[PDB]
């Protein structure tokens, strides 16, 4: 892009796509912070079977991914890429975007996340048998939350998470690069304008998101090997398309 007016238009446009595609409004999440699972409800979650809690989490991830697909669809540049590259970007990026969007549902004051109508701590997911992954996700959401990420910042940051020209498989790499660089300009322009450039150094390191995605795939492979019929019969087709 040439001149601040085109960069600023991009900023507004990305922010709007984000707002239209966020699954939950931020104030609905904040208004729920006192609604916390009782110890008896926690125990109830801990006693659920591994396979049932996997299914539930997969369903919830699938719904979050659907909103990310709509996000990508509303970024003009994205829909200008060829279909192969759309899919490449979404298969590598969708989970990473959800993982970023989850910080909004995380309360750093008590280390809880909004899940199925109330806030609960990481002990809520014990039945999954992936304590390392869960703990890493909670830690990631705590990092971002410490930054006090604004809605506008999440918009712009998650547009960049998705439009990543380093994804293996991209055919029009140069085109993705151009889009990535215009979105980087937009993000950094907005940071500069809002006096928020101090967060650049505090953003999680490159590959952190990749590490969570790969743990997620690795824990999935173990679960699937234990319960292959559950995955086939009861995991969402989109989920399996992105991760199996």
């Amino acid at each position: 892009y040439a001149s601040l007016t085109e960069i600023e238009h991009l900023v507004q446009s990305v922010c709007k796509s984000y707002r239209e595609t966020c699954q939950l409004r931020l104030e609905d999440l904040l208004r729920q912070r006192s609604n916390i699972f009782s110890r008896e409800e926690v125990t109830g979650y801990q006693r659920k079977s591994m396979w049932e809690m996997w299914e539930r989490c997969a369903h919830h991830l699938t719904e979050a991914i659907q909103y990310v697909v709509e996000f990508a669809k509303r970024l003009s540049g994205f829909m200008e890429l060829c279909q192969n590259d759309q899919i490449v970007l979404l298969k590598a990026g969708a989970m990473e975007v959800v993982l970023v969007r989850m910080c909004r549902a995380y309360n750093a004051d008590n280390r809880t996340v909004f899940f199925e109508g109330k806030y609960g701590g990481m002990e809520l997911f014990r039945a999954l048998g992936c304590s390392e992954l869960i703990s890493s996700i909670f830690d990631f959401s705590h990092s971002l939350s410490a930054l006090h990420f604004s809605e506008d910042e999440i918009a712009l940051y998650t547009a960049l998470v998705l439009i990543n020209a380093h994804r293996p498989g991209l055919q029009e790499k140069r085109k993705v690069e151009q889009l990535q660089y215009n979105l980087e300009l937009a993000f950094h322009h907005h940071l500069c304008k809002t006096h928020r450039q101090s967060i650049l150094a505090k953003l999680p390191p490159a590959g952190k998101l990749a590490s969570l995605c790969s743990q997620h795939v690795e824990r999935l492979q173990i679960f699937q090997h234990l319960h292959p019929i559950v995955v086939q019969a009861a995991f969402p087709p989109l989920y399996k398309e992105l991760f199996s």
Binding site: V69, Q83, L90, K91, L238, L242
Partner: peptide
Amino acid sequence: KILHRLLQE
């Protein structure tokens, strides 16, 4: 497949 349908609709 599902992605291709979500991107097309």
